[PDB]
Amino acid sequence: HRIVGYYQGIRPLTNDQAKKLTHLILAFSTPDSQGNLSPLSSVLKQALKAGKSANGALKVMIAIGGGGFDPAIFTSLASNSGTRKSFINNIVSYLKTNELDGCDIAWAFPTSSDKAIFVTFLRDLKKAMAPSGAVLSMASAASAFYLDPGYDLPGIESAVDFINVMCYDYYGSWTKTSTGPNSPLFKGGSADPSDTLNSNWTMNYHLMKVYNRAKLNMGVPFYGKSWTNVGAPLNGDGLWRQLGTYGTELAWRNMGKSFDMTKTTYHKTAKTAYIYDTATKNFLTFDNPQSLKDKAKYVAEKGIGGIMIWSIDQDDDKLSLLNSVS
Ligand SMILES: *[C@@H]1O[C@H](CO)[C@@H](O[C@@H]2O[C@H](CO)[C@@H](O)[C@H](O)[C@H]2NC(C)=O)[C@H](O)[C@H]1NC(C)=O
């Protein structure tokens, strides 16, 4: 039921976008070493106003932290009962001052020594947010490598209104073995070297640990990733190919300008889109309307509570991706 859209300030939020979301999560505000939150940027403030103007039911939240934020500052703030209290008071004050409806904790990543203190922090934060009805969420990781040591999912669930499960970045600049899909729905059959680098594995991990799956959102990306000088398939499937050189992460809106989308291969087992261009040896893994349709159907079939998007401003001007989710 939920459509949770993260927003980075790549371009203005449009009135059509705001009407397709239940929650808009502005990214990011960061705490300093002492727990003061960074001021809301102009581009994020503009999107807050645009969103509420176009959709009076929309909940606009601030994501605190981020993939590019030192997680040791979260450890320090949350571990000390005194600084935990003042940080939480600062967050609640920040929501009031900036006319926000809630916040998303984006801690990348909690370690084994953070597991219990993260739960205490979220529980205490919800208590402070409850009188105003402010919405609390957090972003969850996608592999057991991070999930097992750092995430007490039952405890997190008991504190938050929903969990935004980040089912993407399964392959990237760190991958040394081959190309692969940024965000497949499933394992891709017998040629797939991995059982776990897919959204279905990640969501099943969460489903086995949480009490109520309605509190989960399955995350989907509106971006893809490129490699260059890519060679032959490893074991007969063109999704996993001999590595050349990592390229970059590309927003959907910028893909068609640089890749020939008529050469898209849709992997029928993994449910993922890629392009291998035999002329240039460029490789692109991405999500497209078909993969998002398959993902929305999966969410409905499994009874998962919603879909999360990173990030809605990466969509094209005609909202090809958001309209396929919608
Ligand atoms: C999605 O993931 C689930 C969970 O891993 C897969 O279901 C398992 O499938 C294996 C192989 O058939 C069985 O050993 C388990 O009994 C299944 N567990 C559950 C809870 O169903 C499922 O196959 C995956 N879906 C796809 C399309 O790959």
PDB file of all heavy atoms in Angstrom, residues 226-260:
ATOM      1  N   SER A 226      27.131   0.844 -14.871  1.00  0.00           N
ATOM      2  CA  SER A 226      27.810   0.513 -16.115  1.00  0.00           C
ATOM      3  C   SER A 226      29.210  -0.018 -15.851  1.00  0.00           C
ATOM      4  O   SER A 226      29.851   0.332 -14.855  1.00  0.00           O
ATOM      5  CB  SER A 226      27.907   1.726 -17.049  1.00  0.00           C
ATOM      6  OG  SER A 226      28.725   2.735 -16.475  1.00  0.00           O
ATOM      7  N   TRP A 227      29.659  -0.885 -16.764  1.00  0.00           N
ATOM      8  CA  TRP A 227      31.050  -1.274 -16.920  1.00  0.00           C
ATOM      9  C   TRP A 227      31.437  -1.080 -18.384  1.00  0.00           C
ATOM     10  O   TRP A 227      30.594  -1.122 -19.282  1.00  0.00           O
ATOM     11  CB  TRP A 227      31.310  -2.754 -16.546  1.00  0.00           C
ATOM     12  CG  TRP A 227      31.234  -3.141 -15.067  1.00  0.00           C
ATOM     13  CD1 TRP A 227      32.264  -3.223 -14.188  1.00  0.00           C
ATOM     14  CD2 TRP A 227      30.061  -3.558 -14.352  1.00  0.00           C
ATOM     15  NE1 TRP A 227      31.813  -3.646 -12.951  1.00  0.00           N
ATOM     16  CE2 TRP A 227      30.459  -3.851 -13.028  1.00  0.00           C
ATOM     17  CE3 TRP A 227      28.711  -3.694 -14.699  1.00  0.00           C
ATOM     18  CZ2 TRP A 227      29.557  -4.274 -12.050  1.00  0.00           C
ATOM     19  CZ3 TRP A 227      27.815  -4.124 -13.721  1.00  0.00           C
ATOM     20  CH2 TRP A 227      28.247  -4.404 -12.414  1.00  0.00           C
ATOM     21  N   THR A 228      32.730  -0.891 -18.619  1.00  0.00           N
ATOM     22  CA  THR A 228      33.263  -0.820 -19.973  1.00  0.00           C
ATOM     23  C   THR A 228      34.286  -1.930 -20.181  1.00  0.00           C
ATOM     24  O   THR A 228      34.750  -2.562 -19.227  1.00  0.00           O
ATOM     25  CB  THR A 228      33.911   0.542 -20.256  1.00  0.00           C
ATOM     26  OG1 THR A 228      35.007   0.739 -19.354  1.00  0.00           O
ATOM     27  CG2 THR A 228      32.876   1.675 -20.096  1.00  0.00           C
ATOM     28  N   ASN A 229      34.626  -2.152 -21.454  1.00  0.00           N
ATOM     29  CA  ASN A 229      35.581  -3.188 -21.860  1.00  0.00           C
ATOM     30  C   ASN A 229      35.188  -4.552 -21.292  1.00  0.00           C
ATOM     31  O   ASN A 229      36.024  -5.324 -20.816  1.00  0.00           O
ATOM     32  CB  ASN A 229      37.008  -2.824 -21.458  1.00  0.00           C
ATOM     33  CG  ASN A 229      38.043  -3.609 -22.237  1.00  0.00           C
ATOM     34  OD1 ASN A 229      37.905  -3.797 -23.441  1.00  0.00           O
ATOM     35  ND2 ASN A 229      39.064  -4.093 -21.549  1.00  0.00           N
ATOM     36  N   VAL A 230      33.916  -4.847 -21.349  1.00  0.00           N
ATOM     37  CA  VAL A 230      33.394  -6.091 -20.802  1.00  0.00           C
ATOM     38  C   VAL A 230      33.493  -7.174 -21.864  1.00  0.00           C
ATOM     39  O   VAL A 230      33.254  -6.923 -23.055  1.00  0.00           O
ATOM     40  CB  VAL A 230      31.949  -5.898 -20.315  1.00  0.00           C
ATOM     41  CG1 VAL A 230      31.278  -7.236 -20.053  1.00  0.00           C
ATOM     42  CG2 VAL A 230      31.949  -5.046 -19.063  1.00  0.00           C
ATOM     43  N   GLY A 231      33.853  -8.382 -21.437  1.00  0.00           N
ATOM     44  CA  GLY A 231      34.043  -9.477 -22.371  1.00  0.00           C
ATOM     45  C   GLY A 231      32.965 -10.540 -22.375  1.00  0.00           C
ATOM     46  O   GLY A 231      31.769 -10.234 -22.314  1.00  0.00           O
ATOM     47  N   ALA A 232      33.387 -11.798 -22.445  1.00  0.00           N
ATOM     48  CA  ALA A 232      32.481 -12.897 -22.720  1.00  0.00           C
ATOM     49  C   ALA A 232      31.767 -13.366 -21.451  1.00  0.00           C
ATOM     50  O   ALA A 232      32.229 -13.114 -20.332  1.00  0.00           O
ATOM     51  CB  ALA A 232      33.251 -14.056 -23.350  1.00  0.00           C
ATOM     52  N   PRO A 233      30.636 -14.060 -21.607  1.00  0.00           N
ATOM     53  CA  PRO A 233      29.966 -14.652 -20.441  1.00  0.00           C
ATOM     54  C   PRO A 233      30.866 -15.646 -19.724  1.00  0.00           C
ATOM     55  O   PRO A 233      31.687 -16.332 -20.338  1.00  0.00           O
ATOM     56  CB  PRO A 233      28.747 -15.352 -21.049  1.00  0.00           C
ATOM     57  CG  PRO A 233      28.516 -14.676 -22.337  1.00  0.00           C
ATOM     58  CD  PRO A 233      29.872 -14.293 -22.843  1.00  0.00           C
ATOM     59  N   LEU A 234      30.697 -15.723 -18.402  1.00  0.00           N
ATOM     60  CA  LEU A 234      31.477 -16.672 -17.613  1.00  0.00           C
ATOM     61  C   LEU A 234      31.030 -18.106 -17.874  1.00  0.00           C
ATOM     62  O   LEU A 234      31.861 -19.001 -18.077  1.00  0.00           O
ATOM     63  CB  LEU A 234      31.360 -16.342 -16.124  1.00  0.00           C
ATOM     64  CG  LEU A 234      32.452 -15.477 -15.504  1.00  0.00           C
ATOM     65  CD1 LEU A 234      32.523 -14.134 -16.192  1.00  0.00           C
ATOM     66  CD2 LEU A 234      32.206 -15.304 -14.015  1.00  0.00           C
ATOM     67  N   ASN A 235      29.722 -18.348 -17.853  1.00  0.00           N
ATOM     68  CA  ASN A 235      29.170 -19.694 -17.989  1.00  0.00           C
ATOM     69  C   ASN A 235      27.917 -19.660 -18.854  1.00  0.00           C
ATOM     70  O   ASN A 235      26.868 -20.196 -18.493  1.00  0.00           O
ATOM     71  CB  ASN A 235      28.849 -20.327 -16.632  1.00  0.00           C
ATOM     72  CG  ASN A 235      29.855 -19.976 -15.558  1.00  0.00           C
ATOM     73  OD1 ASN A 235      29.629 -19.076 -14.749  1.00  0.00           O
ATOM     74  ND2 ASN A 235      30.977 -20.692 -15.537  1.00  0.00           N
ATOM     75  N   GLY A 236      28.014 -19.007 -20.008  1.00  0.00           N
ATOM     76  CA  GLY A 236      26.977 -19.052 -21.012  1.00  0.00           C
ATOM     77  C   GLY A 236      25.812 -18.116 -20.827  1.00  0.00           C
ATOM     78  O   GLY A 236      24.904 -18.125 -21.667  1.00  0.00           O
ATOM     79  N   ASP A 237      25.800 -17.310 -19.772  1.00  0.00           N
ATOM     80  CA  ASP A 237      24.728 -16.355 -19.547  1.00  0.00           C
ATOM     81  C   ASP A 237      25.330 -14.958 -19.585  1.00  0.00           C
ATOM     82  O   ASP A 237      26.214 -14.640 -18.783  1.00  0.00           O
ATOM     83  CB  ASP A 237      24.034 -16.642 -18.220  1.00  0.00           C
ATOM     84  CG  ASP A 237      22.713 -15.914 -18.086  1.00  0.00           C
ATOM     85  OD1 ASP A 237      22.666 -14.700 -18.398  1.00  0.00           O
ATOM     86  OD2 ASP A 237      21.729 -16.554 -17.653  1.00  0.00           O
ATOM     87  N   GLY A 238      24.843 -14.131 -20.510  1.00  0.00           N
ATOM     88  CA  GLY A 238      25.415 -12.817 -20.775  1.00  0.00           C
ATOM     89  C   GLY A 238      25.245 -11.800 -19.661  1.00  0.00           C
ATOM     90  O   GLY A 238      25.772 -10.689 -19.781  1.00  0.00           O
ATOM     91  N   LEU A 239      24.522 -12.147 -18.595  1.00  0.00           N
ATOM     92  CA  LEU A 239      24.419 -11.248 -17.446  1.00  0.00           C
ATOM     93  C   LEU A 239      25.710 -11.213 -16.634  1.00  0.00           C
ATOM     94  O   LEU A 239      26.015 -10.192 -16.004  1.00  0.00           O
ATOM     95  CB  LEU A 239      23.233 -11.671 -16.563  1.00  0.00           C
ATOM     96  CG  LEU A 239      22.932 -10.919 -15.263  1.00  0.00           C
ATOM     97  CD1 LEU A 239      22.817  -9.416 -15.505  1.00  0.00           C
ATOM     98  CD2 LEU A 239      21.644 -11.442 -14.663  1.00  0.00           C
ATOM     99  N   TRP A 240      26.478 -12.307 -16.622  1.00  0.00           N
ATOM    100  CA  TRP A 240      27.698 -12.413 -15.818  1.00  0.00           C
ATOM    101  C   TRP A 240      28.867 -12.564 -16.784  1.00  0.00           C
ATOM    102  O   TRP A 240      29.097 -13.652 -17.320  1.00  0.00           O
ATOM    103  CB  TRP A 240      27.628 -13.589 -14.837  1.00  0.00           C
ATOM    104  CG  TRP A 240      26.480 -13.490 -13.868  1.00  0.00           C
ATOM    105  CD1 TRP A 240      26.459 -12.789 -12.690  1.00  0.00           C
ATOM    106  CD2 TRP A 240      25.190 -14.103 -13.995  1.00  0.00           C
ATOM    107  NE1 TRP A 240      25.230 -12.925 -12.081  1.00  0.00           N
ATOM    108  CE2 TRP A 240      24.433 -13.721 -12.863  1.00  0.00           C
ATOM    109  CE3 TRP A 240      24.597 -14.927 -14.957  1.00  0.00           C
ATOM    110  CZ2 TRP A 240      23.120 -14.147 -12.667  1.00  0.00           C
ATOM    111  CZ3 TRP A 240      23.296 -15.351 -14.759  1.00  0.00           C
ATOM    112  CH2 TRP A 240      22.569 -14.957 -13.621  1.00  0.00           C
ATOM    113  N   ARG A 241      29.602 -11.474 -17.004  1.00  0.00           N
ATOM    114  CA  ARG A 241      30.586 -11.400 -18.074  1.00  0.00           C
ATOM    115  C   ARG A 241      31.955 -11.013 -17.536  1.00  0.00           C
ATOM    116  O   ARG A 241      32.080 -10.388 -16.477  1.00  0.00           O
ATOM    117  CB  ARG A 241      30.162 -10.388 -19.136  1.00  0.00           C
ATOM    118  CG  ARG A 241      29.011 -10.834 -19.978  1.00  0.00           C
ATOM    119  CD  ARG A 241      28.611  -9.753 -20.967  1.00  0.00           C
ATOM    120  NE  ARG A 241      27.585 -10.235 -21.889  1.00  0.00           N
ATOM    121  CZ  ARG A 241      27.856 -10.819 -23.049  1.00  0.00           C
ATOM    122  NH1 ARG A 241      29.116 -10.967 -23.432  1.00  0.00           N
ATOM    123  NH2 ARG A 241      26.874 -11.239 -23.836  1.00  0.00           N
ATOM    124  N   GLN A 242      32.987 -11.389 -18.303  1.00  0.00           N
ATOM    125  CA  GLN A 242      34.367 -11.108 -17.920  1.00  0.00           C
ATOM    126  C   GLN A 242      34.567  -9.617 -17.710  1.00  0.00           C
ATOM    127  O   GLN A 242      34.175  -8.797 -18.549  1.00  0.00           O
ATOM    128  CB  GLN A 242      35.333 -11.619 -18.990  1.00  0.00           C
ATOM    129  CG  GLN A 242      35.565 -13.129 -18.950  1.00  0.00           C
ATOM    130  CD  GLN A 242      36.136 -13.599 -17.625  1.00  0.00           C
ATOM    131  OE1 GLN A 242      36.998 -12.943 -17.030  1.00  0.00           O
ATOM    132  NE2 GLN A 242      35.669 -14.750 -17.161  1.00  0.00           N
ATOM    133  N   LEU A 243      35.178  -9.268 -16.587  1.00  0.00           N
ATOM    134  CA  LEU A 243      35.224  -7.873 -16.197  1.00  0.00           C
ATOM    135  C   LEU A 243      36.200  -7.100 -17.056  1.00  0.00           C
ATOM    136  O   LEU A 243      37.287  -7.582 -17.395  1.00  0.00           O
ATOM    137  CB  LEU A 243      35.598  -7.720 -14.727  1.00  0.00           C
ATOM    138  CG  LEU A 243      34.343  -7.578 -13.868  1.00  0.00           C
ATOM    139  CD1 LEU A 243      34.688  -7.293 -12.422  1.00  0.00           C
ATOM    140  CD2 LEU A 243      33.443  -6.483 -14.437  1.00  0.00           C
ATOM    141  N   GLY A 244      35.761  -5.913 -17.445  1.00  0.00           N
ATOM    142  CA  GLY A 244      36.665  -4.847 -17.758  1.00  0.00           C
ATOM    143  C   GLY A 244      36.744  -3.900 -16.582  1.00  0.00           C
ATOM    144  O   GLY A 244      37.319  -4.228 -15.540  1.00  0.00           O
ATOM    145  N   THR A 245      36.146  -2.721 -16.737  1.00  0.00           N
ATOM    146  CA  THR A 245      36.398  -1.601 -15.846  1.00  0.00           C
ATOM    147  C   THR A 245      35.072  -1.005 -15.421  1.00  0.00           C
ATOM    148  O   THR A 245      34.215  -0.743 -16.269  1.00  0.00           O
ATOM    149  CB  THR A 245      37.246  -0.533 -16.536  1.00  0.00           C
ATOM    150  OG1 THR A 245      38.422  -1.153 -17.082  1.00  0.00           O
ATOM    151  CG2 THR A 245      37.649   0.554 -15.544  1.00  0.00           C
ATOM    152  N   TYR A 246      34.912  -0.792 -14.116  1.00  0.00           N
ATOM    153  CA  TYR A 246      33.679  -0.190 -13.623  1.00  0.00           C
ATOM    154  C   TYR A 246      33.505   1.206 -14.206  1.00  0.00           C
ATOM    155  O   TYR A 246      34.473   1.960 -14.356  1.00  0.00           O
ATOM    156  CB  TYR A 246      33.687  -0.124 -12.097  1.00  0.00           C
ATOM    157  CG  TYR A 246      32.384   0.409 -11.533  1.00  0.00           C
ATOM    158  CD1 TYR A 246      31.249  -0.385 -11.528  1.00  0.00           C
ATOM    159  CD2 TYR A 246      32.298   1.696 -11.014  1.00  0.00           C
ATOM    160  CE1 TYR A 246      30.057   0.087 -11.019  1.00  0.00           C
ATOM    161  CE2 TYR A 246      31.110   2.176 -10.501  1.00  0.00           C
ATOM    162  CZ  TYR A 246      29.995   1.363 -10.507  1.00  0.00           C
ATOM    163  OH  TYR A 246      28.797   1.817  -9.999  1.00  0.00           O
ATOM    164  N   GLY A 247      32.262   1.542 -14.542  1.00  0.00           N
ATOM    165  CA  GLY A 247      31.937   2.846 -15.085  1.00  0.00           C
ATOM    166  C   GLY A 247      31.414   3.769 -14.007  1.00  0.00           C
ATOM    167  O   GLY A 247      32.191   4.436 -13.316  1.00  0.00           O
ATOM    168  N   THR A 248      30.096   3.812 -13.845  1.00  0.00           N
ATOM    169  CA  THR A 248      29.503   4.660 -12.822  1.00  0.00           C
ATOM    170  C   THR A 248      28.070   4.210 -12.584  1.00  0.00           C
ATOM    171  O   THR A 248      27.578   3.258 -13.197  1.00  0.00           O
ATOM    172  CB  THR A 248      29.546   6.140 -13.225  1.00  0.00           C
ATOM    173  OG1 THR A 248      29.184   6.952 -12.097  1.00  0.00           O
ATOM    174  CG2 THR A 248      28.579   6.416 -14.385  1.00  0.00           C
ATOM    175  N   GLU A 249      27.407   4.917 -11.679  1.00  0.00           N
ATOM    176  CA  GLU A 249      25.983   4.758 -11.453  1.00  0.00           C
ATOM    177  C   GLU A 249      25.263   5.817 -12.273  1.00  0.00           C
ATOM    178  O   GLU A 249      25.657   6.989 -12.264  1.00  0.00           O
ATOM    179  CB  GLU A 249      25.651   4.895  -9.966  1.00  0.00           C
ATOM    180  CG  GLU A 249      26.520   4.035  -9.049  1.00  0.00           C
ATOM    181  CD  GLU A 249      27.966   4.550  -8.923  1.00  0.00           C
ATOM    182  OE1 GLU A 249      28.181   5.772  -9.049  1.00  0.00           O
ATOM    183  OE2 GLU A 249      28.897   3.741  -8.727  1.00  0.00           O
ATOM    184  N   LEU A 250      24.242   5.397 -13.008  1.00  0.00           N
ATOM    185  CA  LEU A 250      23.531   6.268 -13.938  1.00  0.00           C
ATOM    186  C   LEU A 250      22.065   6.318 -13.560  1.00  0.00           C
ATOM    187  O   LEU A 250      21.428   5.273 -13.428  1.00  0.00           O
ATOM    188  CB  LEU A 250      23.653   5.772 -15.382  1.00  0.00           C
ATOM    189  CG  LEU A 250      24.978   6.016 -16.095  1.00  0.00           C
ATOM    190  CD1 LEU A 250      24.781   5.742 -17.576  1.00  0.00           C
ATOM    191  CD2 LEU A 250      25.442   7.444 -15.883  1.00  0.00           C
ATOM    192  N   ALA A 251      21.529   7.526 -13.426  1.00  0.00           N
ATOM    193  CA  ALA A 251      20.091   7.673 -13.254  1.00  0.00           C
ATOM    194  C   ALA A 251      19.373   7.187 -14.504  1.00  0.00           C
ATOM    195  O   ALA A 251      19.857   7.358 -15.622  1.00  0.00           O
ATOM    196  CB  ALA A 251      19.738   9.134 -12.992  1.00  0.00           C
ATOM    197  N   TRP A 252      18.209   6.559 -14.304  1.00  0.00           N
ATOM    198  CA  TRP A 252      17.380   6.159 -15.440  1.00  0.00           C
ATOM    199  C   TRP A 252      17.239   7.285 -16.459  1.00  0.00           C
ATOM    200  O   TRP A 252      17.376   7.059 -17.669  1.00  0.00           O
ATOM    201  CB  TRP A 252      16.000   5.724 -14.951  1.00  0.00           C
ATOM    202  CG  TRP A 252      14.971   5.618 -16.054  1.00  0.00           C
ATOM    203  CD1 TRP A 252      14.036   6.556 -16.394  1.00  0.00           C
ATOM    204  CD2 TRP A 252      14.763   4.506 -16.941  1.00  0.00           C
ATOM    205  NE1 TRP A 252      13.265   6.103 -17.440  1.00  0.00           N
ATOM    206  CE2 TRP A 252      13.688   4.850 -17.794  1.00  0.00           C
ATOM    207  CE3 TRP A 252      15.371   3.256 -17.090  1.00  0.00           C
ATOM    208  CZ2 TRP A 252      13.215   3.990 -18.783  1.00  0.00           C
ATOM    209  CZ3 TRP A 252      14.903   2.405 -18.087  1.00  0.00           C
ATOM    210  CH2 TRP A 252      13.835   2.779 -18.914  1.00  0.00           C
ATOM    211  N   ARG A 253      16.993   8.515 -15.993  1.00  0.00           N
ATOM    212  CA  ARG A 253      16.732   9.609 -16.930  1.00  0.00           C
ATOM    213  C   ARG A 253      17.911   9.886 -17.847  1.00  0.00           C
ATOM    214  O   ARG A 253      17.731  10.523 -18.894  1.00  0.00           O
ATOM    215  CB  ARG A 253      16.335  10.896 -16.187  1.00  0.00           C
ATOM    216  CG  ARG A 253      17.349  11.424 -15.159  1.00  0.00           C
ATOM    217  CD  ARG A 253      16.816  12.704 -14.518  1.00  0.00           C
ATOM    218  NE  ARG A 253      16.704  13.793 -15.488  1.00  0.00           N
ATOM    219  CZ  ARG A 253      15.589  14.464 -15.753  1.00  0.00           C
ATOM    220  NH1 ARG A 253      14.443  14.123 -15.181  1.00  0.00           N
ATOM    221  NH2 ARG A 253      15.601  15.432 -16.655  1.00  0.00           N
ATOM    222  N   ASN A 254      19.102   9.409 -17.500  1.00  0.00           N
ATOM    223  CA  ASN A 254      20.297   9.658 -18.295  1.00  0.00           C
ATOM    224  C   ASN A 254      20.754   8.442 -19.090  1.00  0.00           C
ATOM    225  O   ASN A 254      21.739   8.540 -19.829  1.00  0.00           O
ATOM    226  CB  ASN A 254      21.432  10.136 -17.384  1.00  0.00           C
ATOM    227  CG  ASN A 254      21.138  11.493 -16.756  1.00  0.00           C
ATOM    228  OD1 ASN A 254      20.569  12.374 -17.403  1.00  0.00           O
ATOM    229  ND2 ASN A 254      21.486  11.649 -15.481  1.00  0.00           N
ATOM    230  N   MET A 255      20.050   7.311 -18.980  1.00  0.00           N
ATOM    231  CA  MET A 255      20.508   6.074 -19.612  1.00  0.00           C
ATOM    232  C   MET A 255      20.307   6.087 -21.122  1.00  0.00           C
ATOM    233  O   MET A 255      21.220   5.741 -21.881  1.00  0.00           O
ATOM    234  CB  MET A 255      19.776   4.883 -19.013  1.00  0.00           C
ATOM    235  CG  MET A 255      20.254   4.516 -17.670  1.00  0.00           C
ATOM    236  SD  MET A 255      19.240   3.182 -17.057  1.00  0.00           S
ATOM    237  CE  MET A 255      19.830   3.205 -15.370  1.00  0.00           C
ATOM    238  N   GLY A 256      19.097   6.412 -21.573  1.00  0.00           N
ATOM    239  CA  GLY A 256      18.786   6.305 -22.984  1.00  0.00           C
ATOM    240  C   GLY A 256      19.620   7.212 -23.857  1.00  0.00           C
ATOM    241  O   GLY A 256      19.773   6.934 -25.053  1.00  0.00           O
ATOM    242  N   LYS A 257      20.175   8.284 -23.279  1.00  0.00           N
ATOM    243  CA  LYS A 257      21.043   9.193 -24.017  1.00  0.00           C
ATOM    244  C   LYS A 257      22.368   8.541 -24.388  1.00  0.00           C
ATOM    245  O   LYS A 257      23.022   8.981 -25.340  1.00  0.00           O
ATOM    246  CB  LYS A 257      21.340  10.451 -23.189  1.00  0.00           C
ATOM    247  CG  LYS A 257      20.179  11.106 -22.443  1.00  0.00           C
ATOM    248  CD  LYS A 257      20.742  11.909 -21.255  1.00  0.00           C
ATOM    249  CE  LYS A 257      19.960  13.190 -20.963  1.00  0.00           C
ATOM    250  NZ  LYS A 257      18.669  12.939 -20.261  1.00  0.00           N
ATOM    251  N   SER A 258      22.800   7.528 -23.630  1.00  0.00           N
ATOM    252  CA  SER A 258      24.135   6.958 -23.762  1.00  0.00           C
ATOM    253  C   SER A 258      24.151   5.467 -24.055  1.00  0.00           C
ATOM    254  O   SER A 258      25.227   4.922 -24.345  1.00  0.00           O
ATOM    255  CB  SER A 258      24.951   7.199 -22.481  1.00  0.00           C
ATOM    256  OG  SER A 258      24.964   8.567 -22.123  1.00  0.00           O
ATOM    257  N   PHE A 259      23.013   4.789 -23.944  1.00  0.00           N
ATOM    258  CA  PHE A 259      22.891   3.384 -24.291  1.00  0.00           C
ATOM    259  C   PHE A 259      21.713   3.211 -25.236  1.00  0.00           C
ATOM    260  O   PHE A 259      20.747   3.977 -25.194  1.00  0.00           O
ATOM    261  CB  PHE A 259      22.689   2.519 -23.045  1.00  0.00           C
ATOM    262  CG  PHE A 259      23.909   2.397 -22.194  1.00  0.00           C
ATOM    263  CD1 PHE A 259      24.225   3.374 -21.267  1.00  0.00           C
ATOM    264  CD2 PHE A 259      24.747   1.302 -22.327  1.00  0.00           C
ATOM    265  CE1 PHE A 259      25.350   3.261 -20.490  1.00  0.00           C
ATOM    266  CE2 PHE A 259      25.870   1.179 -21.545  1.00  0.00           C
ATOM    267  CZ  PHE A 259      26.175   2.161 -20.631  1.00  0.00           C
ATOM    268  N   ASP A 260      21.807   2.198 -26.095  1.00  0.00           N
ATOM    269  CA  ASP A 260      20.757   1.876 -27.059  1.00  0.00           C
ATOM    270  C   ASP A 260      19.764   0.945 -26.373  1.00  0.00           C
ATOM    271  O   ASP A 260      19.981  -0.267 -26.293  1.00  0.00           O
ATOM    272  CB  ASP A 260      21.363   1.237 -28.303  1.00  0.00           C
ATOM    273  CG  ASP A 260      20.349   1.021 -29.408  1.00  0.00           C
ATOM    274  OD1 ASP A 260      19.134   1.151 -29.159  1.00  0.00           O
ATOM    275  OD2 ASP A 260      20.777   0.715 -30.540  1.00  0.00           O
TER     276      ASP A 260
END
